[PDB]
Design a protein around this ligand. Structure first.
Ligand SMILES: [Ca+2]
Ligand SMILES: [Ca+2]
Ligand SMILES: [Mn+2]
Ligand SMILES: [Mn+2]
Ligand SMILES: [Mn+2]
Ligand SMILES: [Mn+2]
Ligand SMILES: [Mn+2]
Ligand SMILES: [Mn+2]
Lengths: 253, 253, 253, 253, 253, 253
């Protein structure tokens, strides 16, 4: 077998990719999302009740569909990154990255020695299909994509430095965490926050990296798309389930 | 402790109850549905990948919320009915009921001996809260509600007979199974099917029984509500999740 | 490997065996019960939320301990008996057995063709340790023990006939189901019920079969032991957990 | 979306299909088997500790791979067939089929009314991808394949009759169950059994149905392939795991 | 919806709260404990085999009952605290807290930016009921209760400093860990340990914080209640299950 | 009850122990491996999708069999070590140990205070069988075995120092991680790597420590056995399953 091509990584330089957040945290719900036709599905290990085993089930569900899986670990934990890479997650979104030093540690966490610190366990990994992918150890990083989140003041204070780290493919802006860090908690739509988000997107793209963002606000998502943002998540499965069931009941109360 | 009051059973004679189908088959998804404020939630053991243990998890999720749980078993199987009652399901919807004899068997399956054939295991049952409900074995049937589905030609051929069975609290009409049985598979909206559904609803109510139905068609649901149908499900969680995610993506393609 | 010896079966002719009911329905709880030193543990597939997979987990937990596992299926269902035997349950307690014809069907359900109807799948079975027990198919029945419950009026009406069925090792009396069937629901301690239980025990032992019973009442359990009852369950894990936590709280209110 | 094409059904008339038995009963183990390149994978609900939910996980695992999934239910239970079809199993292998009447009931169990008795629940089914497959209810049976097992004397006594049932695509011969039924339990390699198996294969193919079989014996599997047997399983995952680990240890003991 | 009121937090200034340790690590066992009437239930993520998903199941079980849930994470890990808060744990017991600096980090781990470092993910959180609690982000901390354990020499060496940390609601004393740290392992009832525990309790209450402790020794528990200890756990589910099953067996040997 | 004897620990000074890697990550697969007769089974928490609860299931499976369980945690994390010891893992293999200071931290993580930092929670631990092992807290470390992996340049740079750490029972060499760290990724068979492995093995044994290694290469495994290596794993369950299924299919293509 040849390595599974990371089409999300390829498309970062060729098109704008529309994303759905998957926080329903099981293989059945991930498969329903996978039938819709999103460019990418974010399996949320940070803010949904997911562990390595529940993320594996969702990777296996989504694997039969064109939608590209991206996994967000709970933190930039190097052993957890090893685990998530070995179950076959090819794109990672690391939350709360705040310095070039931490971003460089995330790069190394995704690469085998001698260049990186990714633990070697190919015989056991769904990532190598248990060595059915014959040259996995020589070619794996070619299809690994590393994204980091800038979503704190220290993040923004280290933005130019993080954007000069080779092997960071994209910087994702977290409006919920960022708005809260800026004293506008629950109010990311404020001009003060949006002006910072827009400038941040322009700087990411000027340094030749992919810019990303999540907004459930259609108008803000279309505006981020008009600015050339490469990977835009436009909704969240839990939010769509709750809102659709509330809207339906309001037709009858 | 007193037995948990079956508010769904009480409201069959006092108000019209708005229902949501739950086929996402896990405790987390059931809890999201339970926060909306539906009168009832149908935990689907027939058409969603549920077993006794997954239904138990969803009962435990929903228990903290005012929405009343109704469980559909895969079939009118007497041992499975025993299992679902013991995990604390107070309202059961039996599919494909086709005779008074079968309807009477379902009544007996929900009542302790000597009058019924429900196996006795109160010490072990969430239904009795493991005997923390002190008189459970004397009072249990007071809060048990039995609904049967008429959704075949044989069911319609035995409708008057089923409607004379004491202990059947309600007859639910299944438009998908019924339209298929009538040679109008996937087309329940056809006048030939609707005329049968309307007459069936009038007969159920004329015999002093609660009538019920599921339609995701708002207009048909409101019409069934205008006819006095006591328990109307107006949507399905799997359908709402898929449709909401599809509608959102189409704003961006 | 040699077949796992069924010490419960052997001891039916040599000693009185003290049992604990296991309805906590998981591997961890089954293991706690296995450390106590009961002669047998009843894994309850009838009145606790168990399925074949949860029962397997509990067999695996208990396997490291001298306590002998007995599995009660939800009903005398021949395909479920097949499943429970193949996961390696060597002793089965069949509920609600009401005729010699049904008891003979249960015997056949436990034996390979050509003399029985047990489906053959030793390559796949924990029962054969995946053919690591080399002659499993020739010797399996030597370590299979079939118990049937008499716990209805029809049961009692067919008692002498069930007791002439070769391959029924033991008849277990269910006081909860029997007292209910006799119109003394939740009142098994009534003289009318107890007189029937005592005569039933004497008739079981006079026909050379093992007699069994469950009572959480110490005095009734000791009386059944004085009558020579071969397998006596003296308590239930769910009841002991609830009762000990209630008793502890009352010291503090 | 268009229905998932049942390539196993198509290939029954065009090539010989090599099968692996999957009894490791989880999604991870099913995915490892799915990487090998077998024409088909038998997910065993009869002789491995599987339920509807564990079979769904294995369907989701295997779905990303060319290997075609076949599900064996524990028995010809019509409600269980409904469940397995709705989770998206397109090929079923029914054990212990013993008459044209039972084979015809299995055909109907796989077809919607008015022609069959398959319960209609497309909105909820992975089979319809939750109605993402737009005309599922009109086209579903085109990609459903029904196989039945002849593996008893009554099976063989009704063979000509079962082979005249329209909608039975294939008859699978079970040498373990058949050898046991013929008084040669654990000894299917006996000439008396093999002569019956060969004649049975010739009769299946002469009536224009697909013949199938499992043998872990390479020589017998190649002989069944030389006779034109359309679907041949050549090994079992549990057997290969145990045998490979035993063979490895014997190099060191 | 309004935020779920934290009655445990409110009662720290108004009454003494009787607790039960929950280490049986599943939703069903948690529900049995929830029926008893304890003021609080400690879901033990440190010393029982729990993960975020098993803890969620137990929160969901307990949610239907007046008993207040308290969750002990395995360690004062900021990302795990984030996870446990988002699944809706309103009271946290942090083990092995040893400095004011660590206690202040725990406070910040429970509060949103800009004043704390709790990651923002309300759309996905059971804590916000998926934004069904409309102002969750503004009001969440009002119903969050932070308890820290002092159970090491370094803890005791930093006690006055931890007790001046604003946002620490309570200090829980761990006699098992403390007695071990003092060289009296498994002997917490020693006068040298008890004298330290009594002085620690008096100092906690003199600084206006709630004092807590676990003892399965009734006499020590009542003594701690006489000293005015605000939250006293009086037993452990695993210990009560094992002890009640042992005591029952000894009546029969 | 007496503590479970750690036969793996005893045999480190008396015989050479043959090991099988278990990365199929479930209780059923672990039981199949446990029936083979390996001296030890490595439950891989680092490179297979395991968590504390799945490792517990595999400990319970293996407990009934003579094969000794060794658990590899994902990293030398002190709270995770506490968790794995409490579920009853008596032998731990710590990956990527790179200094005497880290090796000494691992020793302390496995011992109760006051000499170590293992959290005390015996009442809740399968390790103590919930205090059914009466003196557990006094005797536990006697049956605890700590192994550390040297599999980096820093590890080799600190080898003599790690080998002088009292309480390190064995040093395991990881050829995959070591070959990668030496710039020979996927090529451990290279003379430059093998010469380092052989010298490392001689130093470990000269310092009176047990040496260990994994090789799926029979010739290399036998050579390590000829050098006196005390614990040699000779294969991996995932590799044996995939290879055996591939080899079987190639006989038929
Ligand atoms: Ca199940
Ligand atoms: Ca888990
Ligand atoms: Mn964020
Ligand atoms: Mn229907
Ligand atoms: Mn009974
Ligand atoms: Mn067969
Ligand atoms: Mn402690
Ligand atoms: Mn390694």
């Amino acid at each position: 077998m040849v390595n599974t091509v990371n089409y999300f990584k390829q498309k970062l330089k060729t098109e704008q990719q529309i994303g759905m957040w998957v926080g329903l945290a099981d293989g059945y719900c991930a498969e329903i999302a996978a039938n819709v036709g999103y460019d990418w599905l974010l399996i949320d290990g940070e803010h949904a009740p997911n562990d390595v085993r529940s993320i594996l089930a969702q990777l296996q569900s989504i694997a039969a569909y064109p939608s590209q899986a991206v996994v967000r670990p709970v933190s930039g934990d190097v052993p957890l990154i090893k685990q998530l890479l070995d179950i076959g997650a090819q794109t990672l979104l690391i939350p709360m990255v705040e310095s070039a030093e931490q971003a460089e540690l995330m790069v190394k966490a995704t690469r085998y020695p001698p260049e990186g610190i990714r633990g070697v366990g190919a015989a056991l990994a769904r990532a190598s299909r248990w060595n059915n992918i014959s040259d996995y150890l020589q070619t794996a990083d070619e299809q690994i994509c590393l994204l980091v989140q800038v979503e704190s003041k220290k993040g923004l204070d280290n933005l130019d430095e993080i954007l000069n780290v080779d092997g960071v493919d994209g910087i994702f802006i977290g409006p919920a965490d960022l708005s809260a860090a800026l004293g506008y908690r629950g109010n990311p739509g404020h001009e003060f926050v949006q002006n910072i988000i827009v400038q941040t997107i322009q700087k990411i793209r000027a340094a030749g990296k992919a810019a990303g963002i999540l907004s459930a606000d259609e108008k803000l998502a279309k505006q981020y798309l008009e600015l050339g943002t490469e990977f835009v998540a436009v909704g969240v499965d839990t939010s769509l389930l709750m809102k659709s069931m509330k809207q339906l009941l309001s037709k009858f109360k």
